[PDB]
A paper describes a structure:
Types 1 and P pili are composed of a short tip fibrillum made of three to four different subunits (FimH, FimG, and FimF for type 1 pili and PapG, PapF, PapE, and PapK for P pili) mounted on a 1–2 μM long and helically wound rod, which is composed of ∼1,000 copies of the major pilus subunit FimA or PapA for type 1 or P pili, respectively (Allen et al., 2012, Waksman and Hultgren, 2009). During DSE, the donor strand provided by the chaperone to complement the subunit fold is replaced by another subunit’s N-terminal extension (Nte), a 10–20 residue extension found at the N terminus of each subunit except the subunit located at the very tip.
P pilus rods were produced in vitro from the purified PapD:PapA complex. The P pilus rod forms a helical filament of 3.28 subunits per turn, a pitch of 25.2 Å, and diameter of ∼81 Å. It contains a continuous central hollow lumen of ∼21 Å in diameter. Strikingly, each subunit makes protein-protein interactions with ten other subunits, five preceding (−5 to −1) and five succeeding (+1 to +5). This portion of PapA extends parallel to the rod axis and is termed the “staple” because of the multiple interfaces it makes with other subunits (see below). The sequence after the Nte (from residue 20) forms the pilin fold, a fold previously characterized as a C-terminally truncated Ig-fold-lacking strand G. Compared to the structure of PapA in dimers (representing a state of PapA prior to incorporation in the rod), the structure of PapA in the rod has undergone a substantial conformational change in the region between strands βB and βC, where contacts with an adjacent subunit stabilize an extended region into a three-turn α-helix, αA3.
Numbering used by the authors:
A (entry chain A), B (entry chain H), C (entry chain F), D (entry chain I), E (entry chain E), F (entry chain J), ...: 1 to 163
Write the structure that this text describes.
């Protein structure tokens, strides 16, 4: 007897909301970079890998009322990256592994620092926006650094503030 | 002594079968949507997030013999979504949280209702099929609704019938 | 010790085969059309966007033996499009969104219908072939239709038969 | 008084080791396949579900010294699957349930048999490897087999040997 | 048994609509410029690359009723470019990289500024229109700027308004 | 007579609280790593398994007021791992079993030591944080160490302090 | 009270390094080929599909010092493909499925063999390089081979060595 539906399914929903004037798509909120396979000799020669796109897209920004009512806050943003750093460099990410290598993220004519400090303010427009960042791998600048024929793995976190 | 296999492993299998003329891949049977991070101000301004794909793929439908022998049942389907709804709206999903926000799923020129009722019949073809649905987040239409700077979480269920 | 290959990689392969006399390249099997950004006023004035190419290339058809042994089946094909349609029009695709707009695909001196029915038979030759189709956006012919300043999204499916 | 650590935690570790020349990741050692929801009519028509990936990845194989010192054993492997089988077929897995259905796993141009016997030897390379297998569901080939509108459940085990 | 269509395929559709009097083809909405390979010495000598076409085509403008009913708004448009800029220059795009180079986009007898401000109003006609822009690479005007033998990468965004 | 509820259920709740500025999810507070099945020969050759993720996520950190009022304590943390160690190495976990193998956990450009001592201070940001750690298995560095074809099992504990 | 960052995000990094003189982009390290839908009759007639690009790009090769110090090793490479093969052919990939079909990859005036053996040495230059390979589908050369109207699926692996 008991009736059986010809197709049962379920969908769930998740998200969050902040006081920001602009929204952040999950696709950019988190992400991962793969540098594939690198030549030791190349890195040992002080070489550097090709830049990877760490671009961050901002959506539904409508910073009109925002930049108006908030006065000085005229539609700029900045990021504060945090992670293990190479001593005396800061802008050099101390990857997790048994290698003498490191990762450097760059923004415009500046470098990214992973010491939790904020970077330069970035002007943005109404509606949609995107920040452009590049990441490369090189032999660490640490003293006595040496490239080990192993795997790479590193994690960096950042906060975004609006002005 | 006792011999030891050089690699032992195990694989299990699960599934089910119904009287439907078409099969449903697990990948669509259940799923989850993440709206990432939203701007309060934007939602408070009555704004709405970008559409998310809740598409449902149907496989091995071969509705030939089906639509023939079953007469009036000429190869259409419909969904009956069920969940908490906002009063006097029904098509507005009453998310679980301390926020004045809600989720609306849309199908074609119509909206989805989560009151357990069936939607419009949808013509399908032989072999493979897919239904197209979109989901967005907005400030709830509830009286006195207000957007709280917190997290979002909601669950909706649906049945699928064949005609 | 353990030796490490100087470059490891992997390639996978996928596809399928049917009783058709001609093969179908993946590039045409599935595809997507982007109409960019449209003027509301223009659409509201009953205007229509520019035609997009939905051409379908068929390869390795060699319909010699085919059209011979299969008699009446003298090297023609037809498509059966399926999707949400505007009532009383059928040839008008009921896009998914909160807009009063729709999509119309056209073939030769005829229009495409998304009710799952087959279109006109199309003569083809030996070796290589291609069908030519155009798609445009317009204000829906639905009663009380009105263009909303939002996004567009629609999905249509079709089967191909050989005669 | 008594001091309280500001965050206490614990991590455990498990695994095993064999005389194999190559290691086996847990992720492949065990696993599970879900075929979602199937059409009875389709199965009753003698239809068959889509192939599921039962691929087995082997890591750190370095079969150099191995294939050398072990002579005839020139870097091949094979699997011996074990489970309930359909009589007179063997390569057909007798699922556990009140349905007239069964599961068939396939490897290359051959089928997998669950009678505890070993399959064909598979050449592998140094470093990393992976075997490719597919699984499908069909109406059992058993005499008088009939598809019951219920659930599916089956378990199969296998050993891996190196040559 | 189960019937198999001789060719199954799927096509999707995307786009959006705004209150603009004219439509914008996707082909211009987004795009990319490649300056190929440049001579360091040349750039170091203060040289400048050849102009690249960043032209923006507007379609279905029919600004008749528009320019009429909207009075002062007599069929002109302007762009507001946004991106990283070189200090004290603004019209000089601070590319992302370890080079002392920059990009300058020019329009008519004026230069483009990437500070989010709007440029000069541009008269347009009924039906079809196109704006003409050029882009060149030069050694940055930044203090102490120097050309590094590396790669170039930059992203700029803009909004379009109608008057 | 006696009435019977149509569904009785019960839910319990557990947890704890410390003076830490940040909270610790149970999911990270405790956890377990499985290295699956390893090759003896590989380990005997001095090989090492692939890195496993022992990442520790910290939530609701809001270290604003914290890092302020606590002066020198400017938002850093460190871990003190404790367990059986291999003599003269310390950073090598003396697993429990009849094998000549051991486990090494690594953090950034440093290794983890299980002698109860604290590791390097790790800068963290406001809101959410995560530490990245890797674990591998190798043939123990103990004198006369030899890999036995058996099972692996080890337990390590750690405390977390905030500065 | 507790402060909430206006946008939190996280990025991870992965990769590896080998003793190779040249680096390998992930995009080529792994990949997948789709042959779309094929005609049975065509394959049965001994026909063959169109060639697919399996090109492998090598980056940052700088084989100057390499080819010098390593003497005989004057800047050549070769691949060793491994997978299921058709008996007495080797260069014919025994796809996984219930079809009488197979895949053949070709390089220059030679064919690729999936028996784990190395192919011909390929001269490469300094900086950037790319190898060109084609893949096609045909009716298997196996005895009694016959094309089944089903799906295709195959996996092949290879190592890269430098001389």
């Amino acid at each position: 007897a008991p009736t059986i539906p010809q197709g049962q399914g379920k969908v769930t929903f998740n998200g969050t909301v902040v006081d920001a004037p602009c929204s952040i798509s999950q696709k950019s909120a988190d992400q991962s970079i793969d540098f594939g396979q690198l030549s030791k000799s190349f890195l040992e020669a002080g070489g550097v890998s090709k830049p990877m796109d760490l671009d961050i897209e901002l959506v539904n920004c409508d910073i009109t009322a925002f930049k108006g009512g908030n006065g000085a806050k005229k539609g700029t943003v900045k990021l504060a990256f945090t992670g293990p750093i190479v001593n005396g460099h800061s802008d050099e990410l101390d990857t997790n592994g048994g290698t003498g290598t490191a990762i450097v993220v760059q923004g415009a004519g500046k470098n990214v620092v992973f010491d939790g400090s904020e970077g330069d303010a970035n002007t943005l427009k109404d509606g949609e926006n995107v920040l452009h960042y590049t990441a490369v791998v090189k032999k660490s600048s640490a003293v006595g650094a040496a490239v080990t024929e192993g795997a790479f793995s590193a994690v960096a976190n950042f906060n975004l503030t609006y002005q």
